[PDB]
Write a protein that binds this ligand. Structure first.
Ligand SMILES: OC[C@@H]1O[C@@H](OC[C@@H]2O[C@@H](OC[C@@H]3O[C@@H](O)[C@H](O)[C@H]3O)[C@H](O)[C@H]2O)[C@H](O)[C@H]1O
Ligand SMILES: OC[C@@H]1O[C@@H](OC[C@@H]2O[C@@H](OC[C@@H]3O[C@@H](O)[C@H](O)[C@H]3O)[C@H](O)[C@H]2O)[C@H](O)[C@H]1O
Ligand code: CA
Ligand code: MG
Length: 315
């Protein structure tokens, strides 16, 4: 995938027995040479680094304090934790989207930061604050958090996002600004079709002729009480209609459950999917039942059946 490049790595041959600094919530990954990076929810957007993809060390943050403009959109925010970053690489620039919000409310904005490199030893390393991408207010029926960027088969970039309210949103981006095209409409593409509309964290990939919409269902953010699960559906057109493996509309609670966790890893969710050739990984967090529900980075190989549906080997 041109905008999530991994090189010549065979994700299926790696031994993903992760070690080190694994606290993470809503993680995404990028690779640049021998170095791998995780961006995740935390103070100023938290960053980890790894020499190999398996052993992780904390590497600080994107911003020392909240960008000043954020306060205009979310004036009640009184801490610097930024949520659910998403990274892609395009025209020689890293585009890093992130969410400014407060829990349980839809007064929110997605911001964009850019860099020419992810290696802070590189003299060109500098995260530039590129301001707001798209917002939500209390009068809107959507929530401007949980961004993902995907490029469609025609090379057009798209932003999915959303969490509760009417569900998952989709909008076309301008290639020059990497923010919503002035003549683009907001489309709702997935919903539980019930209240609470517990669907969030979209991530869309294109694989072998379909767009796959990965989402998280049910309740994050409750430690060992979480009920998060990862679900997927697909469509031949990026604008839908997305359906699950059984044929259920993702606008009516459709979604094939890929993982609902186990006795140790509770509430897996807020996922990302990356490719290296035909090989693939699923990246997500899960709440560690041993270690007091602390959200933990997971990276697992993701297989694809002969009907094109993804699956994990542990199920
Ligand atoms: O999960 C992320 C964080 O919580 C998410 O939602 C907070 C939720 O508030 C309720 O949503 C109410 C919605 O208004 C209706 O139109 C819509 O259909 C309802 O679902 C949920 O029970 C809380 O988790 C936020 O998105 C973010 O804070
Ligand atoms: O239970 C443990 C969880 O740790 C905290 O981590 C940071 C939290 O993430 C924010 O919400 C981000 C939303 O959840 C994502 O999976 C949803 O898709 C993102 O938008 C929380 O509000 C921050 O506190 C969790 O809160 C905490 O519950
Ligand atoms: Ca995400
Ligand atoms: Mg082997």
């Amino acid at each position: 995938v041109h905008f999530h490049p991994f090189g010549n790595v065979n994700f299926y041959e790696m031994d993903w027995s992760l070690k080190g600094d694994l606290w993470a919530h809503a993680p995404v990954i990028a690779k640049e040479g021998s170095r791998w990076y995780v961006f995740h929810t935390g103070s100023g957007i938290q960053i980890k680094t790894s020499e190999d993809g398996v052993h992780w060390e904390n590497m600080g943050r994107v911003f020392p304090s909240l960008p000043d403009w954020c306060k205009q959109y979310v004036p009640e925010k009184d801490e610097d934790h930024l949520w659910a970053p998403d990274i892609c690489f395009y025209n020689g620039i890293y585009y890093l989207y992130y969410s400014v919000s407060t829990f349980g409310k839809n007064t929110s904005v997605i911001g964009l930061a850019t860099n020419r490199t992810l290696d802070p030893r590189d003299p060109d390393y500098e995260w530039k604050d590129m301001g707001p991408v798209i917002h939500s207010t209390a009068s809107d029926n959507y929530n401007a958090i949980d961004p993902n960027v995907v490029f469609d088969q025609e090379g057009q970039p798209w932003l999915s996002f959303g969490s509760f309210w009417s569900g998952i949103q989709l909008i076309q981006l301008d290639t020059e600004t990497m923010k919503p095209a002035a003549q683009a409409e907001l489309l709702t593409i997935a919903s539980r079709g019930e209240e609470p509309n517990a669907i969030e964290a979209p991530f869309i990939v294109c694989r072998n002729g379909y767009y796959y919409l990965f989402v998280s269902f049910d309740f994050c953010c409750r430690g060992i009480e979480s009920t998060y699960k990862i679900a997927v559906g697909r469509s031949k057109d990026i604008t839908g209609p997305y359906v699950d493996k059984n044929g259920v509309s993702m606008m009516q609670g459709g979604g094939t459950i890929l993982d609902a966790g186990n006795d140790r890893w509770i509430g897996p969710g807020h996922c990302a999917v990356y490719f290296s050739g035909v090989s693939a990984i699923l990246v997500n967090h899960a709440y560690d039942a041993l270690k007091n529900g602390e959200p933990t980075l997971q990276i697992r190989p993701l297989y694809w059946d002969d009907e094109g549906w993804p699956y994990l080997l542990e199920h």
